[PDB]
Amino acid sequence: GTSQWLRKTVDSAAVILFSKTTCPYCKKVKDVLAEAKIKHATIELDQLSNGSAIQKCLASFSKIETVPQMFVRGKFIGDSQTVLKYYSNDELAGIVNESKYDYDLIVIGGGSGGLAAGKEAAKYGAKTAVLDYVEPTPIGTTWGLGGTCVNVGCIPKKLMHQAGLLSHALEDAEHFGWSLDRSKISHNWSTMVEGVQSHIGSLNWGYKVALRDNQVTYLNAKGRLISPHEVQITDKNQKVSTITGNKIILATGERPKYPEIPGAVEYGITSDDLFSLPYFPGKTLVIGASYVALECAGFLASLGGDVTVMVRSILLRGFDQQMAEKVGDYMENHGVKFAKLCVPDEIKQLKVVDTENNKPGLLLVKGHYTDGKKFEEEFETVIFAVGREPQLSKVLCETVGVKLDKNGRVVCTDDEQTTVSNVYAIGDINAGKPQLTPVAIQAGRYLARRLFAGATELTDYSNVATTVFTPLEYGACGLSEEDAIEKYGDKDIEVYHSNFKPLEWTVAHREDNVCYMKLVCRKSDNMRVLGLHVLGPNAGEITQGYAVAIKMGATKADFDRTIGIHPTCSETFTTLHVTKKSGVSPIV
Amino acid sequence: GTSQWLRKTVDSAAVILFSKTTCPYCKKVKDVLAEAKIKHATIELDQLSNGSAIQKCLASFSKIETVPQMFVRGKFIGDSQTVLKYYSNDELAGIVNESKYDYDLIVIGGGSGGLAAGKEAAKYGAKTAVLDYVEPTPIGTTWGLGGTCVNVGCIPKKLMHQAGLLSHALEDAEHFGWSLDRSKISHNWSTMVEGVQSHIGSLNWGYKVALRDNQVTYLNAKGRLISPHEVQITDKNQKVSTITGNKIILATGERPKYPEIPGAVEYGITSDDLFSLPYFPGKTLVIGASYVALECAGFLASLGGDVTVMVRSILLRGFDQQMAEKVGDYMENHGVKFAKLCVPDEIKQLKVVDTENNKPGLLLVKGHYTDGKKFEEEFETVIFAVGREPQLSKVLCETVGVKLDKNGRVVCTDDEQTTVSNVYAIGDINAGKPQLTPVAIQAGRYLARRLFAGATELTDYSNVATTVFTPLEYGACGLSEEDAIEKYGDKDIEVYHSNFKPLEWTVAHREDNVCYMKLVCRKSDNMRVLGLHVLGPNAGEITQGYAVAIKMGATKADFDRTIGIHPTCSETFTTLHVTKKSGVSPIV
Ligand SMILES: Cc1cc2nc3c(=O)[nH]c(=O)nc-3n(C[C@H](O)[C@H](O)[C@H](O)COP(=O)(O)OP(=O)(O)OC[C@H]3O[C@@H](n4cnc5c(N)ncnc54)[C@H](O)[C@@H]3O)c2cc1C
Ligand SMILES: Cc1cc2nc3c(=O)[nH]c(=O)nc-3n(C[C@H](O)[C@H](O)[C@H](O)COP(=O)(O)OP(=O)(O)OC[C@H]3O[C@@H](n4cnc5c(N)ncnc54)[C@H](O)[C@@H]3O)c2cc1C
Ligand SMILES: Cc1cc(C(=O)NNc2ccccc2F)no1
Numbered sequence A, B: 001g002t003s004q005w006l007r008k009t010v011d012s013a014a015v016i017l018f019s020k021t022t023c024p025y026c027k028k029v030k031d032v033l034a035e036a037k038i039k040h041a042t043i044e045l046d047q048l049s050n051g052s053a054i055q056k057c058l059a060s061f062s063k064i065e066t067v068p069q070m071f072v073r074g075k076f077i078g079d080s081q082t083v084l085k086y087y088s089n090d091e092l093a094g095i096v097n098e099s100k101y102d103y104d105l106i107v108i109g110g111g112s113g114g115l116a117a118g119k120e121a122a123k124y125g126a127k128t129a130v131l132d133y134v135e136p137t138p139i140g141t142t143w144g145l146g147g148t149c150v151n152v153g154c155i156p157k158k159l160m161h162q163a164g165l166l167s168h169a170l171e172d173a174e175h176f177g178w179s180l181d182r183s184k185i186s187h188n189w190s191t192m193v194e195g196v197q198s199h200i201g202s203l204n205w206g207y208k209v210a211l212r213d214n215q216v217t218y219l220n221a222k223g224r225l226i227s228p229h230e231v232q233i234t235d236k237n238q239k240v241s242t243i244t245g246n247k248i249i250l251a252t253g254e255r256p257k258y259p260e261i262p263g264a265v266e267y268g269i270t271s272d273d274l275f276s277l278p279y280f281p282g283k284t285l286v287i288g289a290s291y292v293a294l295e296c297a298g299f300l301a302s303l304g305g306d307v308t309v310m311v312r313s314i315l316l317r318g319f320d321q322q323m324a325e326k327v328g329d330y331m332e333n334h335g336v337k338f339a340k341l342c343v344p345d346e347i348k349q350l351k352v353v354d355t356e357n358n359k360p361g362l363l364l365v366k367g368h369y370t371d372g373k374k375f376e377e378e379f380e381t382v383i384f385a386v387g388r389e390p391q392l393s394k395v396l397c398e399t400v401g402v403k404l405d406k407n408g409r410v411v412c413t414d415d416e417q418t419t420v421s422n423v424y425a426i427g428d429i430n431a432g433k434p435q436l437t438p439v440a441i442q443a444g445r446y447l448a449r450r451l452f453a454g455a456t457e458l459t460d461y462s463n464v465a466t467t468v469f470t471p472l473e474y475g476a477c478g479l480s481e482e483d484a485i486e487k488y489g490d491k492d493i494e495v496y497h498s499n500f501k502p503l504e505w506t507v508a509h510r511e512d513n514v515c516y517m518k519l520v521c522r523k524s525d526n527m528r529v530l531g532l533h534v535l536g537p538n539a540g541e542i543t544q545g546y547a548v549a550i551k552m553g554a555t556k557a558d559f560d561r562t563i564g565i566h567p568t569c570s571e572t573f574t575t576l577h578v579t580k581k582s583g584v585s586p587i588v
């Protein structure tokens, strides 16, 4: 056990020092490497459980059992006297820089996971390159460094959500005594987009600064893995070349799908285009029913838009369907129109986008309802939100041997390793994993530490909490009620639930019984909490802390013995008592 | 053990049925009791692990070991045949109403704890009275049923906090694209007070409806305990009479203190007066530095007021002082003035309150700083927030034998029992307990179940989370950093911390490094989280869920392995890494 860990650690680390905190010979070597600007990992043996056993295993590489011992890319370099000899003789810089490869690590993809992995690897002395290229959308939209979340995802969508939430803050202000008249106030799309894009631009620049300050080589080029250690790159001038690397991390993400119907690619847009659109969309149709579809329809309606959503079957497939129906009912009562049980057949152009006067075009959408009736209506903008997919045929030569599943995602071990031993995959392209930004970041950072600092901790992908940022937000952690019932049986499941009303909604005359929460519990396991669900304001802030308790195995008794904070929405979880089986009403 | 539990349960319950879920004779007795509208507790012996032992112990009370067995106020009434006999002979109603006392329970005080205890007791058949009287403030202010939180505490203060938060929402809305101009909008104090008071009145009415629907006797009268079982009551016509009860719960709360200086009682006010004041306070001095003082100063400033706070020594004594100083620095940067190291000597009247034109008066405040320099300034309103105190000499004859501590609070066992065996105390008057509304509710409900339904569960008063609703909110759960170091020593304490910026503050151009969080941990106990602290928006929603994890013994490793929800403020707790001992900056 200990011998196999040490072997893997030594073969993989770029530069690593084995040390003890109390040793002045170790401190002497540490200070030399700091002066020479040589970054490295450090393993303090006096702070590990079996440090004595490791110290004896080191002799199988160095034939000494003392400390310090310095290694570079699998090779024992020397003890204190030897390292100072290389330093005194101006031979140290050359020894720590010799490698079979151009880089210790090449990351293909500069998004949530890839930037996290590359920066963390560099901190331990791995010579690292990060490659990023943004293929333009069909209408030509492109953006800077940082990935989907930063540029066309979590960041701009939550900022536009906040712009929509402020519409209701303006209405509430009158009831709390402020003198404004909400009915005389309007919204300016282009002013909002300019502020959002200025923030995104500051993130693009901050990531380039961060890579420079960690000595990471940033290449704005398209990468393609042609053999296990060779990456072909093509730059903005179509100059083609090859770089080599010891370890490879694939982190290229996904892009939006289009349906295979006439006019979709030519005349519609996706979320990739929405967040920098230079004109207000006008009367809008959203095709789809994912969290992306509902989040976008929701803020467009709150900004004052005329918005319709076309739903093939159900809302939020894969989420708790009682919660999903309450989400949609709120949206329908607050100005979002729905075309239910309906699909599109073709998009026809009636007017071209007026790019000079900054106005949308006009489109005729034809489709049909599931019974057989026809749909036909005119819209200024049509947004497709019908799923996302990777396109690893762009990234990955089939001769390399990296196995993909039937959806085109990478099949990985529980430590992110592919079927090719030096190649790993993280983020949205790792098959079977939750497709979320904090998951990609944790996977990338934890992987970098295992490769270059001898860490052993794995990423835990179970019970990862989520929040859907619809007009009324929906947070969740764990199983839906229907998945719990299918797994364990109805007689082994107890559900505690309640409506609630935020105190802030009282003076503002908002609804009494629309916010809702529940705990789905397993009777035969001490009433273990299998899933937590909340519909209400600030749902992400409410849910996050409970994710720690669920990770730890919280029971209903743990929620009961914990005391609430008053007045809050979250405290309602500490006093739940009405069960679904009792038939008693959950209203306030 | 079991036999001591059974004797206490039988002696104390008003009406109780010993039963098994599987027994049709028990079902027949349940159905008769429901038809006669006789409320009662039930214990299902087949749901307890020592149910066989309990069934044998019942025989020393009834001389039988079968189920069902019905008891009334410590007396065995009968089995199935006997209960049915009393019913068909119209004898049962008189039997179940036989009592040595007028009531099974008298609650003195109709606030957070007292209303909770009284309603819960009545559910198990306890004949219950709740007494409530509101002694007017020095200027004559009074209010309805529900206690301090409902009328002059948590509820109106958080509603006025929300009105203040909406000021910054109006400012933010411009940056997100909305057409309003914040500089032309003003606030109307009387409109806000009218809305707050209409909500408080709906709560007053709802509590009277709830007591009527639970068959609880509500007496709007002042109560005084004159012997262990006798309560003297004085009504609004000054009629004096005596009622008797088996169990007594003291739940009379506290009221604000005034300093002993000339003019304080005559010309100043307290929080009791603020929340229904018919005119805007105008230019205001708040004397004190408690959470009540800073919350009130904070929202008055956000509503456009000229506000000063006079601080004797420090802010928020008893809270973590690094967090208290950050709370005050934010207020001072956003328009609250502070007179530090200063106390008042006298209040002089310059103008009487203008009741006709609905305007405040004018006052001259004289004081001095700790070095002896003088303070002298004019204000329209002076609010004293210098602590709260019970006044149990008004509630409790000294000859009854209930022991008080040096501060005048009631000394209780861990099951809320006083030194008089049938008398219990809950809420703010229970010595040594956190003075919070959800604590009083849990204590009252749990106590009623122990008295009248044979329950055993105690209230857990440890690590109860809190939130201070200052303009930037401060949430906490567990020990302050200085208390942790005093208890375990500095070398056994590690502190992880970080600044953060809410995403909502980016486009709004608010501050980069004002929000802050830390985890105070114990090294020698697996890095156990001893205390959690957060300064930021929605801090009560952030903190609540983590209180369950801390109750369960969370360590830093539990926070690390839990994944964040993005984009949120709370997710910053899941990736903390900078220690105070490293000296590395917490800025982001
Ligand atoms: C509209 C929307 C909203 C979302 N909201 C949230 C939210 O609120 N919370 C949340 O947790 N998640 C959210 N997500 C999900 C989140 O955006 C993703 O889970 C995350 O971005 C995945 O990170 P990644 O590192 O796997 O890939 P990405 O961030 O997509 O980065 C991959 C990068 O690699 C580049 N690349 C691709 N091929 C190559 C190549 N051959 N050579 C070089 N570079 C290449 C891509 O152009 C891209 O820049 C949202 C997603 C969308 C679409
Ligand atoms: C300004 C302010 C803000 C607060 N904010 C919060 C907050 O945000 N969160 C929180 O958790 N806590 C808050 N608190 C504390 C909370 O109000 C108290 O902890 C809670 O009200 C205590 O409940 P209680 O049942 O002990 O007493 P109370 O609610 O004070 O009820 C006691 C009642 O008994 C009556 N009474 C007294 N003597 C007699 C008698 N002889 N006969 C009959 N009736 C009598 C009193 O008039 C009163 O109606 C706040 C307090 C204040 C002052
Ligand atoms: C807001 C949001 C995003 C997701 C998500 O990313 N993926 N779902 C998923 C879950 C578990 C395993 C595998 C998966 F693919 N869920 O909610």
Ligand SMILES: Cc1cc(C(=O)NNc2ccccc2F)no1
Binding pocket: B133, B135, B220, B221, B222, B234, B235, B236, B237, B238, B394
């Ligand atoms: C020391 C003390 C005695 C009383 C007194 O008489 N209270 N009775 C009363 C009850 C209800 C409304 C109005 C009332 F006056 N108050 O304080």
Ligand SMILES: Cc1cc(C(=O)NNc2ccccc2F)no1
Binding pocket: B291, B318, B432, B433, B434, B435, B436, B466, B467, B468
């Ligand atoms: C054991 C213990 C805790 C306390 C106490 O400080 N209670 N009150 C309080 C605290 C924090 C915020 C708001 C509050 F009202 N007294 O004794």
